[PDB]
């Protein structure tokens, strides 16, 4: 149907990709198919190669303290393209079957089986001053013309196409995010029951979250305010699991619960980008360009993080806080902070056609 053709600065090297959005089925990934149109009698008899980088422009340190763009290629694959490989007995896919016949004998395919336990493209939100090369995992299909793998990869003919290993929400939700916490405040009375729960395990981007804050404060202390906050657990695995929790939506209503009384009010709230545009370092869905993308979908993989060596594992949970009055003597300076954490996956629904249609000025 439609293909994506990028050309080198000279024009001799051209790469025809099928789709720049590859779904991760956790167990398996969509192979990166495509063809490369290379001039036989005009490339000065130089073999051309295809390189799938998985650049991770992140890691430890912050604000350029001791680290600046520490690119770590989590997975790089190089396949010979101009030579028709050594006994290439592999399927050509329907994408390269029609493309090869259309362009002729000067177009040679290349396939990139992406590893299963490898991160999804999640570009960290750049700061207002920050621009250009952002952070986070970013895949790239890079076809260059080099006699050997180490030939400086001449920039004139080093075509690179940016792709994503996007992931979409499962079509089968299971349990309910029900989890309760109890605390014997000052060991006075029976512990308060904060039996908060959500409405649905999987929340699509923009859909509401129904936080059903249920409180039975039996202790003498009464809550000054109840805050329900949705947090984005960006667990950057480049370091020793340097998890960076970040709240993306807050609902702190001054509704107060009396001692020896019950309370139950659904704290409907929704995470979006307008209120979180200021928060730099936020994990966003992978960007092929400076386009605006949603918050990073909850990253999932086969058996969870079965072999997650490194990469941003974005996960979401809501924080059902309960700001109570100070235990015993209250000096208006301290407050007990009973809270409950409820997990949920904020992943896009499964699309049918090409993912993005957003208007591009």
């Amino acid at each position: 149907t439609r293909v994506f053709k990028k050309a080198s600065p000279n024009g001799k090297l051209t790469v025809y990709l099928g789709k720049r959005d590859f779904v991760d089925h956790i167990d398996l990934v969509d192979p990166v198919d495509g063809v490369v149109l290379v001039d036989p009698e005009y490339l000065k008899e130089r073999r051309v190669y295809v390189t799938l980088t998985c650049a991770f422009r992140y890691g430890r340190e912050d604000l350029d303290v001791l680290g600046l763009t520490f690119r770590k290629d989590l997975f790089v694959a190089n396949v010979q393209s101009f030579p028709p490989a050594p006994e290439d007995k592999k399927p050509l896919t329907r994408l390269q079957e029609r493309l090869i016949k259309k362009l002729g004998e000067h177009a040679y395919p290349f396939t990139f089986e992406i590893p299963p336990n490898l991160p999804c493209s999640v570009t960290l939100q750049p700061g207002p001053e920050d621009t250009g090369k952002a952070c986070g995992v970013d895949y790239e299909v890079k076809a260059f013309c080099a006699e050997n793998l180490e030939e400086k990869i001449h920039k004139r003919n080093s075509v690179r196409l940016v792709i994503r290993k996007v992931q979409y929400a499962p079509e089968r939700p299971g349990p309910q995010p029900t989890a309760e916490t109890t605390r014997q405040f000052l060991m006075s009375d029976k512990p308060l029951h904060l039996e908060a729960s959500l409405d649905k395990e999987i929340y699509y981007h923009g859909e509401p979250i129904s936080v059903n804050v249920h409180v039975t404060n039996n202790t003498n202390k009464t809550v000054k305010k109840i805050k329900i906050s949705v947090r984005q657990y960006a667990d950057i695995c480049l370091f020793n699991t340097a998890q960076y929790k970040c709240p993306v939506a807050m609902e702190e209503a001054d509704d107060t619960v009396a001692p020896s009384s019950t309370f139950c009010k659904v704290y409907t709230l929704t995470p979006f980008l307008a209120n979180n545009r200021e928060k730099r370092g936020l994990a966003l869905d992978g960007k092929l360009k400076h386009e605006d993308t949603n918050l990073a979908s909850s990253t999932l993989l086969r058996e969870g993080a079965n072999r997650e060596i490194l990469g941003i594992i974005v996960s979401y949970k809501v924080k059902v806080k309960l700001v109570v009055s100070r235990g015993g003597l209250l000096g208006d300076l301290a407050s007990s902070d009973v809270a409950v954490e409820l997990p949920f996956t904020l992943m896009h629904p499964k699309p049918k056609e090409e993912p993005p249609h957003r208007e591009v000025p």
Epitope: R2, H205, E207, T270
Partner: antibody, heavy 118, light 107 residues
Framework: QLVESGGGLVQPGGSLRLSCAAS????????IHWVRQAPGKGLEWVAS????????YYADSVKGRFTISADTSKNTAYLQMNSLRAEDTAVYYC?????????????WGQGTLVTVSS | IQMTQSPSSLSASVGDRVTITCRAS??????VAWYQQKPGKAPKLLIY???SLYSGVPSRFSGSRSGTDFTLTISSLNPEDFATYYC?????????FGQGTKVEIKR
């Protein structure tokens, strides 16, 4: 299901306020678009309040005349037709394109005609 | 962008093929949608992505795809299909609609 109101007569240079009562939809998961149709003429885009990326696009004709907002608590995308010229008389429609995967303007409002004359 | 529908008026009765070609001023890729508007009613989405047919509409409508031209074939042309059709692009912020193609019974 979308419902709109606010049509009537405005003097040349006056101001009118139109709103959409988006029912069953969300203002964050679905951008709200206001579409103009002159009587006997083709459709013409006016404004679009994404309300997720916080961007409110505008037509070249009505650039700063409009101030479209979005009251998410009431699930409305309020629009302000201000400085209505005589040639701004039309029927104004409300459309709800998906915030992600645009896929056209599927849900449409009834339409509130805004006649501007002295 | 200036998307224009060459068949401004289609005087075709039921059972006659009705191809409404809409050619954009410049390449709008595959971001074109088609709406059907009855006389004095609200437009109804028919197809999106210039090929994908919207859920809940008859399969008589089928959109073509080209460099800048986006035809819409109907063929059956039921009485419900006798309305005005608009081609709209969403590949750029100034979303541009088509002029409109009124379809009337041939007499």
């Amino acid at each position: 299901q979308l419902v709109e109101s606010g049509g009537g007569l405005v003097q040349p240079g006056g101001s009118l306020r139109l709103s959409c009562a988006a029912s069953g939809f969300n203002v964050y998961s679905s951008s709200i678009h206001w579409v103009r149709q002159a009587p006997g003429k083709g459709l013409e885009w006016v404004a679009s309040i994404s309300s997720y990326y916080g961007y409110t696009y505008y037509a070249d004709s009505v650039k700063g005349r409009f101030t479209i907002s979005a009251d998410t608590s009431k699930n409305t995308a309020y629009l302000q037709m201000n400085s209505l010229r005589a040639e701004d008389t039309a029927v104004y429609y409300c459309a709800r394109s998906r915030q992600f995967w645009y896929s056209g303007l599927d849900y449409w409002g009834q339409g509130t005609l805004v006649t501007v004359s002295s | 962008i200036q998307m224009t529908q060459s068949p401004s008026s289609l005087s075709a009765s039921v059972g006659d093929r009705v191809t409404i070609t809409c050619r954009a001023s410049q390449s709008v890729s595959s971001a074109v949608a088609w709406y059907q508007q009855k006389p004095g009613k609200a437009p109804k989405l028919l197809i999106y992505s210039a090929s994908s047919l919207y859920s809940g509409v008859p399969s008589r409508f089928s959109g073509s795809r080209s460099g800048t031209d986006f035809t819409l074939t109907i063929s059956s042309l039921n009485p419900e299909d006798f309305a005005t059709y608009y081609c709209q692009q969403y590949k750029y912020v100034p979303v541009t609609f088509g002029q409109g193609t009124k379809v009337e019974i041939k007499r």
